[PDB]
Each structure stands twice: as structure tokens, then as C-alpha cells.
Amino acid sequence: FTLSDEKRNHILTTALNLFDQFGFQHISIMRIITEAKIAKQSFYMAFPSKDSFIIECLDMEINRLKQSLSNLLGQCGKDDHTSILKSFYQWHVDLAYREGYNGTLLTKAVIEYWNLPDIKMKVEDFNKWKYEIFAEYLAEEINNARLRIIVSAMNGILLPASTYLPTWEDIESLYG
Amino acid sequence: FTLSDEKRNHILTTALNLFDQFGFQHISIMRIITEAKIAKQSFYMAFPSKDSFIIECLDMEINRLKQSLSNLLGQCGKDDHTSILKSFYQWHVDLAYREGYNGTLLTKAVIEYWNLPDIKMKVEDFNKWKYEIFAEYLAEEINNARLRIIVSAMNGILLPASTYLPTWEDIESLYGE
DNA sequence: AAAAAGACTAATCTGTCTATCTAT
DNA sequence: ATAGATAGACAGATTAGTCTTTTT
DSSP: OOOHHHHHHHHHHHHHHHHHHSSSSOOOOHHHHHTTOOOOHHTTTOOOOOOHHHHHHHHHHHHEEEEEEEHHTTTOOOOOHHHHHHHHHHHHHHHHHHHOOOOOOHHHHHHHHSSSSHHHHHHHHHHHHHHHHHHHSSSSSSHHHHHHHHHHHHHHHSTTTTTTTHHHHHHHHHHH | OOOOOHHHHHHHHHHHHHHHHHOOTTTTHHHHHTTTTTOOHHHHHHHSSHHHHHHHHHHHHHHHHHHHHHHHHHSTTTTTTHHHHHHHHHHHHHHSTTTTOOSSSHHHHHTTTOHHHHHHHHHHHHHHHHHHHHHHHHOOOOTTTHHHHHHHHHHTTTTTTOOOOOOOOHHHHEEEE
């Protein structure tokens, strides 16, 4: 009748792991219901439809990636512009350089869910946020021409089935 | 027990136009058959299953992307490395600016079919082919640290819901160094 | 015989939604 | 009565193998 946030946040986390491992298509409600040690009726007292459940899962993953990159950049010196560059590269690395990587969860949401314009907007607002939060740290050094190439090159790393990825020493030569 | 190859390409091209705008899991084979104005049994005589049809659809797209890039870089002036880099850049922007872009058809096949290992191999074979055919025309080594950044910046243009696309003058200033 | 159109079916699998059934 | 499990059940679609009729 009123799903507890202990249980409510369990269908979200269980589905997010099932979605990142596989896909939005393969993983069904019945798959998440059993693995989250929950029933089917109580799942609908907090989420009306599956499309609302996918949007809810996307906002949680976007906020997760937001805090993940926010803390990683704040651990370097304000004048150490090279440490911010390496943290930005290693952040895109530990995502793509993982076992069973088939793209980020945000890229999957834009491919399967072109029907809802709010989903592509939610991902676009984060990609713009990732660029602007990275330029906030390095605004007095790297110019906008090189910044757009740095971020676009880092986005090419997140692209699955990509070859000839730019190493850190390759990124080191761009700064100087 | 055999099918006309003219009809074979009609089922293949109809599904490709359906997948590039809607993805693989949205379009069913009953929709592909009804959209191609063909019969349901003629689809199974040529293609044994649905995954065999998808892999055949991926091989046709890669060979299409191969000739499209081989020609665009080939029609450029000989030893005009700047004009080739400009055509290589405008090629990725032309793909990302196509209406209804939710990702490359290769990216969808990789994401939506993680189970089939040969799908991830064919796209990896294409991206490996794309980087090496670019170093050939530029008279540059296959290990140029600049080249690895240029191509990866172009793939970032093909990212779904991308933003802050680098301008041509940005890619020009890199190669100018 | 060859190909090509036409539904059958069947075995399957979901999306919600009903109908209780408790323990609390 | 709240909360949460535990089921089938309506309603669609669905992929693959069957059967019929037909034109070349």
C-alpha cells in the first residue's frame, strides 16, 4: 500500500545492476521482482508504469555519475591543472576499461527510449554538465578549442567496441 | 528452397532503415516483413533465424560505411592532408546531424546484443579499419598520439545525446601543431 | 517442381491487474 | 486497516515451423 524506501530503493538498485550488465530490453519486471526479494503488487504502489520506472532509474544513475565525478575532481590542487586532467581521463577509463562493458547506462537510455524526449534531455543536460564542470576547474589554462577536443576524445572512450584509444601519455602531450 | 537476391536486399534494406531510427528490439520481423511487402515464409528460406538476419544486416552496414568513407577520402586532392582531415571531420558531423539520431547502427548492435561475440568483433574490426585507413591518407604513422586523439574526438561526435562538438578550426589547430 | 503469397499455432513471455491471505 | 507477499488472469504481441492455394 505504501512501499518503504528500504524496499522501494531495492527495486531501483537491483534493476540498475541488471540493466548495466545486460539491457533495458532483456531485463523485465519479473526479473527484477524476484531478485529484489519483493512482490509485483507492491512494485506498483511506488511506480505506476515501467516507463516511469525507467525514468526514475535514469535520474538515480545521472545523480550517481554527477557525485562520482564531482568528488574525483575536488581531490586535486587548485593550481595542479595536470591532476584535474588525469582525474578526468581516469574517470572515463574505469567505466570503459571494465569487464562486460557495453556502453554507459545513459547511452542505453537514448537508444531504446527515443519516444520520451525527457530522457534524451536528461542525458544531454548531463553531457553538458560534464563538459562545464570540467572547464570550471581548467578555465585559466586550456582554451575552449582544446577543451572541446579533450571532452570529445574522452566521450569516444565511452563508446563501446572502440579501437585505438588515446592513452594518458597521449593526453599528457596536449597540455604540455 | 531458394530466394531471389533482389528480394533478399529488399528485406535487408527495409530493416536497416527501421533499425537506424527505432533500434533493434522495437522493430519485429513481422513488421519488417509487412513493411517490405513480402511473405513471412520467404524470410525464413533465405535467413535461417532472426539473429542470422541481424548479422547479415550488420555486414551490409559496415561495407556501406566502408565505401562511403573510402570514396569521401578518395575524392579529395592527392597529398592534400588538410582537405582529407576536413572531409573526415564533416563525415562524423554529417552522421550526428542526421534527423532522429539516437546512435550509430553499429553502436546499437553492440549494446543491444552483448551475447553475440561476433557482433562486437565486426564493429571492432570496422573501427580498427577506420583508424588505419585514416592514417594511410594522412601519410602519418599508425601510432601518432595526435591521431589517436583526433579519431577519438570524432567518435565522441557520434555519441548519442552529445554536446559541445569541436569545430573544424579546433581539429585544424591540433593538426597544425 | 520453384517460388510466392496467406494465416495457423504454439509455445512463449511478457506488461499490469485481480483476489486473497495473511501477520501486524 | 497497513503493508507486502502470492499468486493466476486479461490482453497483446511474438518467433519459428505447418498447411493450403497459386502462378510460372
